[PDB]
Amino acid sequence: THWFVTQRNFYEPQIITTDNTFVSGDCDVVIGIVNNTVYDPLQPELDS
Amino acid sequence: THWFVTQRNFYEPQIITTDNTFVSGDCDVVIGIVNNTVYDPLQPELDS
Ligand SMILES: *[C@@H]1O[C@H](CO)[C@@H](O[C@@H]2O[C@H](CO)[C@@H](O)[C@H](O)[C@H]2NC(C)=O)[C@H](O)[C@H]1NC(C)=O
Ligand SMILES: *[C@@H]1O[C@H](CO)[C@@H](O[C@@H]2O[C@H](CO)[C@@H](O)[C@H](O)[C@H]2NC(C)=O)[C@H](O)[C@H]1NC(C)=O
Ligand SMILES: *[C@@H]1O[C@H](CO)[C@@H](O)[C@H](O)[C@H]1NC(C)=O
């Protein structure tokens, strides 16, 4: 149901965050791309 | 005109940002240092 990022030698899922991913390009030129949400922890801090 | 940071084996320029850099010392003990401006995306996030 959810998506996580983990290492390739031990199972240790983490929730997707901007600190864990690297952004580049557009959503057209990648085969097999899947859609989900990339979170941002700074928004609650800014709103508070 | 502009200064970028890129990898060594494939030309892919990224905009100079405080996330890509690392701070140490002052501007007197490095030969060939160059004046420029290091941007910061935190200010628009915390202001706008
Ligand atoms: C993104 O998720 C959606 C929903 O599953 C997929 O469907 C398309 O999404 C884009 C933008 O998210 C829309 O512009 C299209 O109209 C959607 N097509 C539909 C609903 O048939 C999409 O495949 C996912 N991936 C991308 C890259 O959009
Ligand atoms: C470019 O960098 C040099 C050295 O970092 C600057 O030279 C110094 O500038 C300060 C004030 O900006 C002065 O107080 C010093 O006397 C200057 N020293 C020398 C040896 O010139 C220079 O001003 C910088 N230029 C710009 C446009 O920022
Ligand atoms: C390269 O050599 C020139 C000599 O004309 C000098 O002015 C310049 O500072 C040198 N650049 C570096 C990075 O040392």
Side-chain angles (χ1 to χ4, degrees), chain A residues 18-40:
Chain A
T18 279
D19 301 337
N20 313 343
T21 88
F22 154 70
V23 192
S24 91
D26 180 55
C27 286
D28 164 14
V29 294
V30 170
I31 323 164
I33 197 159
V34 190
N35 235 332
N36 195 289
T37 301
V38 192
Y39 279 57
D40 191 353

